[PDB]
Write a structure and sequence with these properties.
The structure is cut from a larger assembly and holds three copies of chain A, one copy of chain B (222 residues), two copies of chain C and one copy of chain D (138 residues). With 244 residues, chain A is α+β, with helices and mostly antiparallel strands. Chain A is built from six helices and eleven strands. By secondary structure, chain B is α+β, with helices and mostly antiparallel strands. Chain B has a domain of 63 residues: Arc Repressor Mutant, subunit A (Orthogonal Bundle). In chain B, strands 1, 2, 3, 4, 5, 6 and 7 form a seven-stranded mixed beta sheet that branches. Chain C is built from one helix and no strands. In chain C, 18% of the residues are buried. The chains are: A alpha+beta (244), B alpha+beta (222), C mainly alpha (50), D mainly beta (138). At the B-D interface, strand 2, helix 2, strand 3, strand 6 and strand 7 of B face strand 1, strand 2, strand 3 and strand 6 of D. Strand 6 of chain B pairs antiparallel with strand 2 of chain D, so a sheet runs across the interface. Chain A binds one RNA strand of 6 nucleotides through loops. Chain A: It is found in: Nucleus.
Chain lengths: 244, 222, 50, 138, 138, 152, 196
RNA sequence: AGUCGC
């Protein structure tokens, strides 16, 4: 505060759909006071206990039971940054574990689960306070959500079907910023469709709508992309300033 | 021979034992089998360059578990026993470690989530309180206060200032155990009023303080 | 984007004009470039003052 | 034979209550322990420097034999159990509970460099300037 | 409704993602983050904290110089389930009634609710008694 | 400011107390090249061998000679640092270094005040100083950049 | 309120030209009592006193909570009781097949020689950390309780999980050595994945 | 204090 230039003021790359790009004050506090994205959500926190039980039962070997002089090949697994154990087949584990998340044996909004292949680590997070956003799931080079789910959403006008049911189909997922680093994320159904040799075909998530990266005040401003970027920031202050 | 000696007979036989990891629910079921004399049977089927091990539960106890073999090369596992007769013996070496795999990991989970729920239920915070009016009834005094009053109201209260000689004897008796005491202790052991115990201690004795007004009195030892 | 994409779009350079509109990614990278301009105004203002 | 085709099947028993506690004694494979060369051993709780919580002291053969330290594992299992499957003269299997898991590790017969003297002081002076002679002056 | 067999038309356009987005706000709503955290804070955390591990015991001093015949009395205090009543207000008369947020602003009140806890008193002195235990809701 | 550290590809320390039967049989003809080099006190010089390999590309740019480097290091350290070098007729360039002692006085009088650290360990301090402090044509401390420009 | 993520080690290149790299771990029971615990493992560089070994740029020390003086990581391992240098090497780097990692630690082993038992090492940490107390044994017991309670508390709070802490401390040295080889990226200051 | 104005 008051005399210190720094890089935690400049919009960082990871703030994509996590925190509004252009909604931070124009005064000395610029960029330090940020504003949450529209689709952004924040994990409320949960006990790690169930995950630990499923892992030990699946095939995770306990720390003091293994032999240290034989672990180089093995992948280290952590839960809330606590090093719980080791594994010799992380690919079947990750695939199975996610399947459980889609099926809700562990809480979606909660568990973040990340694999860092080049380091052979598996980090899992269930602590409070992580920023995450909903995305569509794509599978076998195409979207997993089908128009029949839409017809239930139209039906909601007189039925109990809801966004929670939509999460229960496992067609949408919650992704925190640490996990968002390791996904291959298509911009829009259109692009994921035309693709043949256009770019790649390995996508795993897709954006529910790209204009969601904006925070509350930035959404009032129409055609924000035909404006010079700081121009959008002055409007986010002034819109908040108007009366009515 | 002594209890500090470790019997090597088992080790001296070079006896091998098997090490199997099992889920708590299966062993809890065994735990409530008690002494039926069995919990199941183990089946081993061997082929060319391959071995299959499995377990079947007792049908009575149920009212196929495949085995996965494990490396033991990286640890020299052995077993010892601590007897109820306080005798120690080295029973054998682990020649194999293994894991008991469930018949199905997937559906099980329904039971498991329910299973987790049964051990794990602190149904907390949980139900507001709608409203309450128990900021407590107002008696005439605390119930226990009345108990305190009753105690005070039982014999003890006034003290026996009469008979200086017996009280003199009591001081002499104090002087029979130790050279000095705290005046707080002196009133406790004598059951007399402080002003009077002082009046006597001025007459036949002296005082000696230490540190921060910590005082002891003595019947002039000589 | 895909890992290691030095090609001009994944790393900076916007093709469109303010009239055509910026694609979503183009839009966000532009906001990064606009922020430098906002921050520099505040930091420079204090230092010259002194 | 077992090298070609074989099948075995043995009943598994659990006694209602064992007459003794069953414990695990684990060694590092790197220590390559061979009990073939053990002839005597003593095993007693280190307790004098301050019982069932206290570490193990393993003393093999005579005083000049190797000594090891046994450290207790926090619990046998945190969500499971460990059981021993044993062969019996009738031809059955017998299964025994684990009561404790202990880690056992090697100790030097006689090393002891000690820092109580002024080794810490020598460290203040330590410019990596000596190594053998300090071990000799001991 | 689905079966993934006779279906051949997965395509779905702008018109439809907004249906999905609407359902997100219909379910969650714009401020959810604040509310979900506070709710979890009551539903979990204030319970977790009194359900900690600091049951306090107190033993007054006895046999102060003399003594003999037992009893330096001993008391232990334990805490149980926590209750929270909907936000109430007490007039100077002493009579409580429900508050409503509009009232709370006009008259400048604080919009809070009263918290109660189960407490236990427990005497297992040195011998004469042990069961005399009483539950309170305070 | 070019330090020997910039030019050096790699270093190695060997125990080779018998040059006439060196630990690298392939290195053996260069020992044949040096036997007239103080043959009397090879019984006196230390048995530890330092061997260095140099990058041809750095050596070309700095347009140096192996005799320039050898003369630089010997001059810089002093007479103690006994140097010999490989033949220029190779794409690779390697330098072999031994240390000479104080000869006559080393007869172990009181206890040889050195506190008897191993001579190799002294050699690593030599190599350390040798990498960082040696300044072949590095006439000053201008970090290590130098950019030439043509101005029109 | 935005803060730095607890329970996870990240590597930094701060200003102080005498610290080459440092590994930071903020380790509170963000569900216990909310203290802090800020273990630092710092790699010292630039120097070497005299003819020490020509290049001090590998003398890895450790800050610990409520310790008045920096101590080398190896003492803490001695204090955990793993006197066996091969075992400490096993906790630090479970791939002793690479000569370069083995050389990187070696001068830190060289420092370790002055202290060669758990008790005395405990007496070192006690006196380097606390107020003066010629009691020796209490200095050892208090320090024993600090290692038990204060260091990496997220990994445990008792004797019965004292081994588990040893791997994790060792993992930080490993996580640090990787950066020091440079085959590992230096971790950003402001990545949102590392925020709460 | 913080918010905020240029």
């Amino acid at each position: 505060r008051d005399g210190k230039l720094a890089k935690p003021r400049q919009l960082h790359n990871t703030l994509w759909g996590m925190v509004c790009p252009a909604e931070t004050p124009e005064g000395h506090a610029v960029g330090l006071v940020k504003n949450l994205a529209l689709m952004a959500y924040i994990s409320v926190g949960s006990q790690p206990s169930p995950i630990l039980e499923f892992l030990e039962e699946w095939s995770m070997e306990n720390l003091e039971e293994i032999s240290p002089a034989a672990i180089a090949d093995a992948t280290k697994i952590f839960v809330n940054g606590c090093w719980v154990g080791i594994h010799k087949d992380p690919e079947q584990l990750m695939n199975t574990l996610r399947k459980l998340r889609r099926q809700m044996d562990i809480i979606v909004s909660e568990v973040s689960m990340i694999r860092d292949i080049r380091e052979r680590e598996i980090r899992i997070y269930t602590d409070a306070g992580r920023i995450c956003r909903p995305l569509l799931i794509v599978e076998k080079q195409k979207l997993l959500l089908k128009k029949r789910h839409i017809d239930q959403l139209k039906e909601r006008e007189y039925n109990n079907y809801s966004w929670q049911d939509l999460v229960a189909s496992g067609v949408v997922e919650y992704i925190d910023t640490l996990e968002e680093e390791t996904v291959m994320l298509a911009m829009t159904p259109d692009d994921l469709q035309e693709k043949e040799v256009a770019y790649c075909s390995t996508y795993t998530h897709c954006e529910i709508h790209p204009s969601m990266i904006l925070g509350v005040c930035a959404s009032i401003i129409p055609f924000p992309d035909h404006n010079q970027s700081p121009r959008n920031t002055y409007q986010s202050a002034m819109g908040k300033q108007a009366m009515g | 021979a002594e209890r500090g000696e470790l019997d090597l007979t088992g080790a001296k036989q070079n006896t091998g034992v098997w090490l199997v990891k099992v889920p708590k629910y299966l062993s809890q079921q065994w735990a409530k089998a008690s002494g039926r004399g069995e919990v199941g049977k183990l089946r081993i089927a061997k082929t060319q360059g391959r071995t299959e091990v499995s377990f079947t539960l007792n049908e009575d106890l149920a009212n196929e578990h495949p085995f996965v073999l494990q490396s033991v090369g990286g640890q020299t596992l052995t077993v010892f026993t601590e007897s109820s007769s306080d005798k120690l013996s080295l029973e054998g070496i682990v020649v194999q470690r293994a894991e008991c795999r469930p018949a199905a990991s997937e559906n099980y989970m329904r039971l498991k989530r329910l299973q987790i729920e049964e051990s794990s239920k602190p149904v907390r915070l949980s139900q507001q309180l709608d409203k309450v009016v128990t900021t407590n009834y107002k008696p005439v005094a605390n119930h226990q206060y009345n108990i305190e009053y009753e105690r005070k109201k039982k014999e003890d209260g006034k003290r026996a200032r009469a008979d200086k000689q017996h009280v003199l004897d009591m001081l002499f008796s104090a002087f029979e155990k130790h050279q000095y005491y705290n005046l707080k202790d002196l009133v406790d052991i004598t059951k007399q009023p402080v002003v009077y115990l002082k009046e006597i201690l001025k007459e036949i004795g002296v005082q000696n303080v230490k540190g921060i007004h910590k005082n002891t009195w003595e019947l002039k030892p000589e | 984007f895909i890992k290691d994409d030095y090609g001009p779009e994944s790393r900076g350079f916007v093709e469109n004009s303010y009239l055509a509109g910026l694609t979503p990614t183009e839009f966000f990278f532009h906001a990064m470039g606009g922020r430098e301009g906002l921050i520099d105004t505040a930091v420079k203002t204090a230092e010259t003052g002194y | 034979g077992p090298s070609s085709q074989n099948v075995t099947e043995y009943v598994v028993r659990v006694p209602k209550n064992t007459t003794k506690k069953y414990n695990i004694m684990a060694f590092n494979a790197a220590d390559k322990v061979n009990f073939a060369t053990w002839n005597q051993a003593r095993l007693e709780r280190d307790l004098s420097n301050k019982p069932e919580d206290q570490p193990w002291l393993l003393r093999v053969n005579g005083k000049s034999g190797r000594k090891f330290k046994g450290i207790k594992k926090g619990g046998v299992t945190e969500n499971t159990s460990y059981y021993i499957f044993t062969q019996c003269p009738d031809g059955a299997f017998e299964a025994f509970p684990v009561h404790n898991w202990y880690n056992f590790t090697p100790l030097a017969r006689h090393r002891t460099l000690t820092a109580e003297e002024a080794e810490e002081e020598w460290e203040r002076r330590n410019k990596v300037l000596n190594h053998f002679s300090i071990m000799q002056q001991r | 409704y689905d079966e993934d067999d006779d279906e051949i038309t997965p395509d779905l356009w702008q018109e439809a993602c907004w249906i999905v987005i609407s359902s997100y706000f219909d379910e969650k709503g714009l401020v959810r983050q604040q509310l979900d955290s506070f709710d979890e804070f009551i539903q979990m955390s204030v319970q977790r904290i009194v359900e900690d591990a600091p049951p306090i015991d107190l033993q007054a001093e006895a046999q102060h110089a003399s003594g003999e015949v037992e009893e330096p009395p001993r008391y232990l205090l334990k805490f149980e389930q926590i209750y929270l009543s909907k936000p109430t207000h007490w007039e100077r008369d002493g009579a409580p009634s429900p508050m409503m947020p509009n009232e709370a602003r006009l008259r400048n009140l604080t919009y809070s609710a009263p918290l109660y806890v189960d407490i236990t008193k427990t005497v297992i002195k040195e011998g004469e008694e042990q069961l005399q235990t009483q539950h309170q809701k305070t | 400011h070019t330090t020997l550290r910039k030019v050096t590809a790699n270093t190695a320390i060997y125990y080779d107390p018998n040059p006439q039967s060196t630990v690298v049989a392939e290195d053996q003809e260069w020992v044949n090249v040096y036997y007239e080099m103080p043959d009397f006190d090879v019984a006196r010089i230390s048995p530890w061998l330092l061997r260095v390999e140099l990058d041809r590309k750095h050596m070309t740019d700095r347009k140096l000679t192996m005799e320039q480097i050898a003369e630089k290091i010997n001059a810089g350290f002093g007479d103690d640092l006994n140097c010999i070098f490989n033949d220029d007729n190779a794409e690779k360039l390697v330098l072999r270094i031994r240390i000479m002692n104080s000869d006559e006085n080393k007869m172990q009088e009181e206890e040889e005040v050195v506190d008897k650290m191993d001579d190799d360990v002294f050699l690593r301090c030599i190599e350390s100083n040798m990498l960082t402090d040696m300044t072949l044509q590095g006439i000053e401390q201008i970090s290590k950049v130098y950019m030439h420009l043509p101005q029109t | 309120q935005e803060k730095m993520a607890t329970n996870t080690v990240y590597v930094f290149a701060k200003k102080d030209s005498k610290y080459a790299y440092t590994g930071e771990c903020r380790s509170c029971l963000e569900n216990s009592s909310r203290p802090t615990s800020t273990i630092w493992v710092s790699m010292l560089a630039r120097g070497g006193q005299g003819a020490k070994k020509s290049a001090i740029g590998q003398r890895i020390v450790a800050t610990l909570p409520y310790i008045k003086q920096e101590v080398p990581i190896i003492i803490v391992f001695r204090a955990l009781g793993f006197v066996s240098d091969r075992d400490i090497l096993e906790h630090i780097i479970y791939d002793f097949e690479d000569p370069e990692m083995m050389e990187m630690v070696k001068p830190s082993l060289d420092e370790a020689f002055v202290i060669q038992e758990q008790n005395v090492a405990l007496n070192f940490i006690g006196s380097r950390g606390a107020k003066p107390g010629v009691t020796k044994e209490k200095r050892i017991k208090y320090a024993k309780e600090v290692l038990q309670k204060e260091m990496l508390p997220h990994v445990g709070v008792s004797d019965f999980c004292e081994t588990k802490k040893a791997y994790f401390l060792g993992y930080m040295v490993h996580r640090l050595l990787l950066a020091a080889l440079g085959r590992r990226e230096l971790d950003d200051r402001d990545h949102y994945g590392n925020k709460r």
